[PDB]
Amino acid sequence: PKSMQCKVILLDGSEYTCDVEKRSRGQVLFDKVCEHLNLLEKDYFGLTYRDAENQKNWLDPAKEIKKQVRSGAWHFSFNVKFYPPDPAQLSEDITRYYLCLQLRDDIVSGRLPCSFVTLALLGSYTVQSELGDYDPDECGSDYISEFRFAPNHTKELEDKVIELHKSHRGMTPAEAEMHFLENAKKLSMYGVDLHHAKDSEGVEIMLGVCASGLLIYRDRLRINRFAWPKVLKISYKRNNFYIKIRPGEFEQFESTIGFKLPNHRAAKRLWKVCVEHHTFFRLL
Ligand SMILES: CN(C)C(=O)CNc1ccccc1
Numbered sequence: 692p693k694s695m696q697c698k699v700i701l702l703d704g705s706e707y708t709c710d711v712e713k714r715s716r717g718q719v720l721f722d723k724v725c726e727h728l729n730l731l732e733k734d735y736f737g738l739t740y741r742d743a744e745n746q747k748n749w750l751d752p753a754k755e756i757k758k759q760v761r762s763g764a765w766h767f768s769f770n771v772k773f774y775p776p777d778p779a780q781l782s783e784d785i786t787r788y789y790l791c792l793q794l795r796d797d798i799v800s801g802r803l804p805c806s807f808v809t810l811a812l813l814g815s816y817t818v819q820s821e822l823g824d825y826d827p828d829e830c831g832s833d834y835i836s837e838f839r840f841a842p843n844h845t846k847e848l849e850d851k852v853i854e855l856h857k858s859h860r861g862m863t864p865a866e867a868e869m870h871f872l873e874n875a876k877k878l879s880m881y882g883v884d885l886h887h888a889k890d891s892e893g894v895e896i897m898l899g900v901c902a903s904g905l906l907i908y909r910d911r912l913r914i915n916r917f918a919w920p921k922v923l924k925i926s927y928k929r930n931n932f933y934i935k936i937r938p939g940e941f942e943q944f945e946s947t948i949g950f951k952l953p954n955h956r957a958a959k960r961l962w963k964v965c966v967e968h969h970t971f972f973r974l975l
Contacts, residue, residue, distance in 0.1 A: 692712055693712065693713045694710040694711060694712055694713065695710065695711060695712075695713045695715075695756075695757075695765050696708060696709075696710055696765060697709050697710065697711060697720050697756075697765045697766075697767065698764075698765065698766045698767070699720075699724050699738065699766075699767045699768065699769055700766075700767070700768045700769065701724075701728070701769050702769060702770075702789055702792035702793055702796065703792060707724060707727055707769075709723050709724075709727075711723070711756065713757060714755055714757065715755070715756055716752060716753060716754060716755060716756070717738065717750040717751055717752040717753070717754060717756055717759065718752035718753065719756075720738065720750070720756060720767070721733070721736075721737065721738055721750070721752055724738065724769055728769070728785075728789065729785055730785060730786065730789060731782075731783060731785075731786075732781055732782060732783055732786040734773065734971075735771055735772060735773045735774070735775060735781075735786070735790070736769065736770065736771060736772055736789065737749050737750060737752070737770060737772035738750040738767040738768065738769060738770070739767060739768045739770050740759065740760055740763065740766065740767050740768075741763070741766070742763065742956075743761070743762065743763065744956065746956075746957075746960070748960060749772060749963070749964070749967075750767060770793060771789070771790055771793040771794075772967075773882075773902070773967075773968070773971045773972075774790070774881060774882025774901075774902065775790070775876075775902075775975075776876065776882070776902045776903070776975075777876065778790055778869070778872035778873075778876060779869065779872070779873070784865040784868065787865070787868050787869060787872055788864075788868055790872060791817070791820070791868050791871050791872065791875075794813075794871070794872075794875045795813075795817060795839070798810070798813065798840070798841065798842075798875075799839045799840070799841065799842060800842065801842040802880070802885075803875075803878060803880050803881065804878070804879075804880055805841070805878060807847075807848065807851070808851070809874060809878065810840055810841045810848060811840075811848055811851035811852050811854075811855055812855055812874055813840070813871055813874060813875060814836075814838060814840035814841075814848070814852040814855075815851075815852050815853075815855030815856045815858075815859060816859070816862075816867040816868070816870050816871040816874075817838055817840070817867070817871065818836065818838060818852060818856045819856060819859040819862045819864075819867040820862075820864040820867040820868050820871070821838070821864075824859075824860050824861065825853070825856045825857045825859070825860065830853055834849060834853060835849050836849060836852065838852075840852060880899075881901075882901050882902055883899040883900070883901045883906065884899065884900040884901070884964055884968075885897050885898070885899050886898045886899075886900070886952070886957070886960075886961045887952075887953060887957075888932065888950040888951060888952055888961075889950065889951040890907075890909070890949075890950060890951075891948075891949045891950075891951075893951070894909070896908060896909050896950070898932075898950065898961065900961070900964050900965055900968050901968070902968065902971075902972045902975070903916075903918060903919065903972070904916060904917050904918040904919045904920075904921065904922065905917040905919075905922060905934065905965065907948075917934065917936060919968075919969050919972055919973060920937075921936055921937050922934055922935070922936065922937075922969065923935045923936065923937050923945055924945075925962055925965050925966065925969075926962065927952075927955075927958040927959050927961070927962040928958075929955060929958070930951055930952050930953070930954055930955055930957075930958055931949055931950065931951060931952070931958060932949075932950045932952055932958050932961050932962060933947055933948070933949050933950075934947070934948050934965075935947055936948060
Protein backbone atom coordinates (compact mmCIF):
# COMPACT_ATOMS: atom_id res chain seq x y z
CA PRO A 692 0.00 0.00 0.00
CA LYS A 693 2.01 2.98 -1.38
CA SER A 694 2.18 6.17 0.78
CA MET A 695 3.15 9.79 -0.22
CA GLN A 696 4.98 12.17 2.13
CA CYS A 697 2.90 15.34 2.97
CA LYS A 698 4.45 18.58 4.27
CA VAL A 699 2.10 21.04 6.02
CA ILE A 700 3.08 24.57 7.12
CA LEU A 701 1.29 25.13 10.47
CA LEU A 702 0.07 28.56 11.60
CA ASP A 703 3.11 29.01 13.96
CA GLY A 704 5.35 28.65 10.83
CA SER A 705 6.58 25.13 11.72
CA GLU A 706 6.39 22.17 9.29
CA TYR A 707 4.44 18.98 10.02
CA THR A 708 5.36 15.88 7.93
CA CYS A 709 3.20 12.75 7.59
CA ASP A 710 2.38 10.00 5.06
CA VAL A 711 -0.99 9.05 3.51
CA GLU A 712 -1.88 6.33 0.98
CA LYS A 713 -1.34 7.92 -2.51
CA ARG A 714 -5.10 7.52 -3.46
CA SER A 715 -6.15 9.25 -0.13
CA ARG A 716 -8.93 11.94 -0.11
CA GLY A 717 -8.07 15.38 1.39
CA GLN A 718 -10.07 14.54 4.58
CA VAL A 719 -7.47 11.84 5.51
CA LEU A 720 -4.55 14.36 5.66
CA PHE A 721 -6.72 17.07 7.25
CA ASP A 722 -7.81 14.63 10.09
CA LYS A 723 -4.10 13.79 10.77
CA VAL A 724 -3.12 17.54 10.94
CA CYS A 725 -6.14 18.43 13.22
CA GLU A 726 -5.26 15.48 15.56
CA HIS A 727 -1.64 16.73 15.65
CA LEU A 728 -2.98 20.23 16.55
CA ASN A 729 -5.46 18.76 19.21
CA LEU A 730 -8.18 20.64 17.28
CA LEU A 731 -11.82 19.47 17.62
CA GLU A 732 -13.67 22.44 16.10
CA LYS A 733 -12.31 21.46 12.60
CA ASP A 734 -15.26 22.97 10.54
CA TYR A 735 -13.64 26.49 10.38
CA PHE A 736 -10.28 25.18 8.92
CA GLY A 737 -8.86 23.56 5.78
CA LEU A 738 -5.63 22.90 3.86
CA THR A 739 -4.45 25.06 0.97
CA TYR A 740 -1.97 24.16 -1.79
CA ARG A 741 -0.19 26.44 -4.36
CA ASP A 742 -1.04 25.33 -7.94
CA ALA A 743 0.88 25.27 -11.26
CA GLU A 744 0.13 29.01 -11.88
CA ASN A 745 1.07 29.39 -8.12
CA GLN A 746 -2.36 30.52 -6.74
CA LYS A 747 -3.82 29.34 -3.37
CA ASN A 748 -6.50 26.60 -3.74
CA TRP A 749 -8.49 24.85 -0.95
CA LEU A 750 -7.77 21.08 -0.83
CA ASP A 751 -11.24 19.54 -1.29
CA PRO A 752 -11.56 17.01 1.54
CA ALA A 753 -13.99 14.86 -0.52
CA LYS A 754 -11.62 14.41 -3.55
CA GLU A 755 -8.33 12.54 -4.06
CA ILE A 756 -5.28 14.65 -3.07
CA LYS A 757 -3.49 13.47 -6.27
CA LYS A 758 -6.29 14.81 -8.54
CA GLN A 759 -5.95 18.27 -6.95
CA VAL A 760 -2.13 18.71 -6.55
CA ARG A 761 -1.81 16.91 -10.00
CA SER A 762 1.78 17.69 -11.14
CA GLY A 763 2.77 19.74 -8.00
CA ALA A 764 4.49 18.82 -4.72
CA TRP A 765 2.43 17.43 -1.79
CA HIS A 766 3.03 20.64 0.18
CA PHE A 767 0.20 22.39 1.99
CA SER A 768 -0.65 25.04 4.56
CA PHE A 769 -3.13 24.78 7.45
CA ASN A 770 -5.52 27.79 7.37
CA VAL A 771 -8.79 29.28 8.60
CA LYS A 772 -11.34 28.70 5.80
CA PHE A 773 -14.52 30.09 7.56
CA TYR A 774 -13.74 33.09 9.86
CA PRO A 775 -16.42 33.00 12.61
CA PRO A 776 -18.33 36.33 12.87
CA ASP A 777 -18.41 35.84 16.70
CA PRO A 778 -15.35 33.94 17.97
CA ALA A 779 -16.70 34.18 21.60
CA GLN A 780 -19.17 31.45 20.54
CA LEU A 781 -16.50 28.87 19.61
CA SER A 782 -16.58 26.11 22.26
CA GLU A 783 -12.76 25.76 22.80
CA ASP A 784 -9.91 28.13 23.63
CA ILE A 785 -7.58 26.11 21.32
CA THR A 786 -9.90 27.00 18.39
CA ARG A 787 -9.62 30.70 19.29
CA TYR A 788 -5.79 30.23 19.55
CA TYR A 789 -5.45 28.94 15.92
CA LEU A 790 -7.84 31.72 14.77
CA CYS A 791 -5.50 34.31 16.45
CA LEU A 792 -2.39 32.82 14.73
CA GLN A 793 -4.15 33.02 11.32
CA LEU A 794 -5.22 36.62 11.95
CA ARG A 795 -1.67 37.58 13.01
CA ASP A 796 -0.55 36.36 9.52
CA ASP A 797 -3.49 38.15 7.86
CA ILE A 798 -2.31 41.38 9.54
CA VAL A 799 1.52 41.03 8.94
CA SER A 800 0.82 40.05 5.26
CA GLY A 801 -1.36 43.15 4.72
CA ARG A 802 -4.43 41.04 3.73
CA LEU A 803 -6.16 42.55 6.85
CA PRO A 804 -5.65 46.34 6.89
CA CYS A 805 -5.61 47.83 10.37
CA SER A 806 -5.11 51.35 11.93
CA PHE A 807 -1.96 52.16 13.94
CA VAL A 808 -3.87 51.97 17.26
CA THR A 809 -5.54 48.61 16.38
CA LEU A 810 -2.13 47.16 15.26
CA ALA A 811 -0.67 48.19 18.68
CA LEU A 812 -3.76 46.92 20.62
CA LEU A 813 -3.71 43.50 18.79
CA GLY A 814 0.06 43.31 19.29
CA SER A 815 -0.32 44.08 23.04
CA TYR A 816 -2.78 41.14 23.44
CA THR A 817 -0.43 38.73 21.56
CA VAL A 818 2.47 39.81 23.84
CA GLN A 819 0.30 39.35 26.99
CA SER A 820 -0.84 35.89 25.76
CA GLU A 821 2.78 34.83 24.88
CA LEU A 822 5.05 36.53 27.49
CA GLY A 823 2.47 37.11 30.24
CA ASP A 824 2.64 40.27 32.43
CA TYR A 825 4.71 43.28 31.28
CA ASP A 826 8.34 43.13 32.68
CA PRO A 827 10.68 46.19 32.25
CA ASP A 828 13.75 43.84 32.66
CA GLU A 829 13.09 42.68 29.01
CA CYS A 830 12.09 46.21 27.80
CA GLY A 831 14.38 49.28 27.76
CA SER A 832 13.53 52.57 25.95
CA ASP A 833 15.01 50.86 22.81
CA TYR A 834 12.95 47.55 22.84
CA ILE A 835 11.96 45.80 19.52
CA SER A 836 9.84 42.57 20.00
CA GLU A 837 10.62 39.40 18.01
CA PHE A 838 6.82 39.49 17.36
CA ARG A 839 5.80 40.59 13.86
CA PHE A 840 2.79 42.88 14.43
CA ALA A 841 2.35 44.75 11.12
CA PRO A 842 3.30 44.86 7.45
CA ASN A 843 5.62 47.83 8.33
CA HIS A 844 7.12 48.10 11.83
CA THR A 845 8.06 51.51 13.35
CA LYS A 846 9.62 52.36 16.70
CA GLU A 847 6.41 54.32 17.47
CA LEU A 848 4.38 51.08 16.93
CA GLU A 849 6.70 49.06 19.22
CA ASP A 850 6.40 51.74 21.91
CA LYS A 851 2.58 51.71 21.73
CA VAL A 852 2.45 47.86 21.97
CA ILE A 853 4.45 48.16 25.25
CA GLU A 854 2.32 51.03 26.69
CA LEU A 855 -0.82 48.90 26.05
CA HIS A 856 0.91 45.72 27.32
CA LYS A 857 1.43 47.44 30.69
CA SER A 858 -2.38 47.84 31.07
CA HIS A 859 -3.07 44.03 30.70
CA ARG A 860 -1.44 42.81 34.01
CA GLY A 861 -3.07 39.54 35.28
CA MET A 862 -4.63 38.69 31.90
CA THR A 863 -4.40 34.95 31.06
CA PRO A 864 -3.55 33.72 27.55
CA ALA A 865 -7.20 32.68 26.84
CA GLU A 866 -8.43 36.08 28.03
CA ALA A 867 -5.91 38.11 25.88
CA GLU A 868 -6.77 35.83 22.83
CA MET A 869 -10.50 36.57 23.35
CA HIS A 870 -9.76 40.37 23.50
CA PHE A 871 -7.61 40.02 20.38
CA LEU A 872 -10.57 38.44 18.56
CA GLU A 873 -13.19 40.97 19.85
CA ASN A 874 -11.10 43.74 18.19
CA ALA A 875 -10.01 41.81 15.03
CA LYS A 876 -13.60 40.62 14.23
CA LYS A 877 -14.72 44.28 13.80
CA LEU A 878 -12.16 45.23 11.11
CA SER A 879 -13.82 45.92 7.72
CA MET A 880 -11.68 43.21 5.92
CA TYR A 881 -12.12 40.53 8.64
CA GLY A 882 -12.74 37.17 6.96
CA VAL A 883 -12.93 38.79 3.46
CA ASP A 884 -11.48 36.57 0.67
CA LEU A 885 -10.59 39.06 -2.22
CA HIS A 886 -10.71 38.08 -5.94
CA HIS A 887 -9.55 40.33 -8.85
CA ALA A 888 -12.27 40.77 -11.55
CA LYS A 889 -13.68 43.08 -14.28
CA ASP A 890 -17.31 44.26 -14.36
CA SER A 891 -19.50 43.93 -17.53
CA GLU A 892 -17.92 47.17 -18.89
CA GLY A 893 -14.29 45.91 -18.31
CA VAL A 894 -13.65 48.17 -15.20
CA GLU A 895 -11.28 46.50 -12.65
CA ILE A 896 -13.13 45.63 -9.41
CA MET A 897 -12.54 43.29 -6.45
CA LEU A 898 -15.10 40.74 -5.30
CA GLY A 899 -14.96 39.89 -1.59
CA VAL A 900 -16.43 36.67 -0.13
CA CYS A 901 -17.36 36.69 3.61
CA ALA A 902 -19.69 35.05 6.20
CA SER A 903 -22.52 37.61 5.58
CA GLY A 904 -22.49 37.77 1.75
CA LEU A 905 -20.74 39.14 -1.37
CA LEU A 906 -18.91 42.52 -1.68
CA ILE A 907 -18.15 44.37 -4.96
CA TYR A 908 -15.41 47.01 -4.42
CA ARG A 909 -15.80 49.33 -7.49
CA ASP A 910 -13.99 52.73 -6.91
CA ARG A 911 -14.09 53.79 -3.17
CA LEU A 912 -17.36 55.85 -3.16
CA ARG A 913 -19.19 52.68 -4.46
CA ILE A 914 -19.17 49.35 -2.48
CA ASN A 915 -22.15 47.05 -3.35
CA ARG A 916 -23.11 44.39 -0.71
CA PHE A 917 -25.27 41.30 -1.51
CA ALA A 918 -26.33 39.56 1.78
CA TRP A 919 -26.37 35.75 1.12
CA PRO A 920 -30.23 35.74 1.32
CA LYS A 921 -30.38 38.31 -1.59
CA VAL A 922 -28.12 36.03 -3.79
CA LEU A 923 -30.57 33.48 -5.35
CA LYS A 924 -28.00 31.72 -7.63
CA ILE A 925 -24.32 31.74 -8.79
CA SER A 926 -22.56 30.07 -11.76
CA TYR A 927 -19.38 30.22 -13.90
CA LYS A 928 -18.91 29.76 -17.63
CA ARG A 929 -15.53 30.16 -19.40
CA ASN A 930 -13.80 33.19 -17.68
CA ASN A 931 -17.17 34.47 -16.36
CA PHE A 932 -18.76 34.46 -12.92
CA TYR A 933 -22.49 35.36 -12.68
CA ILE A 934 -24.73 36.08 -9.69
CA LYS A 935 -28.59 36.05 -9.79
CA ILE A 936 -29.91 38.76 -7.29
CA ARG A 937 -33.50 38.33 -5.91
CA PRO A 938 -36.26 40.62 -7.20
CA GLY A 939 -37.08 43.09 -4.40
CA GLU A 940 -40.74 42.79 -3.22
CA PHE A 941 -43.19 43.46 -6.14
CA GLU A 942 -40.64 43.20 -9.03
CA GLN A 943 -41.26 40.45 -11.64
CA PHE A 944 -37.63 39.30 -12.37
CA GLU A 945 -34.23 38.63 -10.69
CA SER A 946 -31.25 40.79 -11.98
CA THR A 947 -27.99 39.11 -13.29
CA ILE A 948 -24.58 40.64 -12.55
CA GLY A 949 -21.70 39.32 -14.67
CA PHE A 950 -17.97 39.44 -14.00
CA LYS A 951 -14.85 38.64 -16.03
CA LEU A 952 -12.14 36.72 -14.13
CA PRO A 953 -8.48 36.37 -15.34
CA ASN A 954 -9.04 32.77 -16.60
CA HIS A 955 -11.43 29.80 -16.30
CA ARG A 956 -9.60 28.44 -13.19
CA ALA A 957 -10.01 31.80 -11.34
CA ALA A 958 -13.78 31.78 -12.26
CA LYS A 959 -14.30 28.20 -10.95
CA ARG A 960 -12.33 28.88 -7.71
CA LEU A 961 -14.45 32.02 -6.96
CA TRP A 962 -17.63 30.00 -7.69
CA LYS A 963 -16.59 27.20 -5.27
CA VAL A 964 -15.55 29.52 -2.36
CA CYS A 965 -18.93 31.39 -2.80
CA VAL A 966 -20.96 28.06 -2.71
CA GLU A 967 -18.99 26.92 0.39
CA HIS A 968 -19.42 30.28 2.22
CA HIS A 969 -23.16 30.33 1.24
CA THR A 970 -23.61 26.76 2.61
CA PHE A 971 -21.58 27.39 5.83
CA PHE A 972 -23.16 30.76 6.83
CA ARG A 973 -26.72 29.53 5.91
CA LEU A 974 -26.30 26.87 8.70
CA LEU A 975 -24.63 29.34 11.16
C1 LIG B 1 -17.20 45.13 5.02
N1 LIG B 1 -17.89 43.90 5.51
C2 LIG B 1 -17.02 42.77 5.91
C3 LIG B 1 -19.28 43.87 5.59
O1 LIG B 1 -19.97 44.82 5.23
C4 LIG B 1 -19.99 42.64 6.12
N2 LIG B 1 -21.39 42.87 5.79
C5 LIG B 1 -21.99 42.54 4.55
C6 LIG B 1 -23.37 42.70 4.39
C7 LIG B 1 -23.96 42.33 3.23
C8 LIG B 1 -23.21 41.79 2.19
C9 LIG B 1 -21.84 41.64 2.34
C10 LIG B 1 -21.22 42.01 3.50
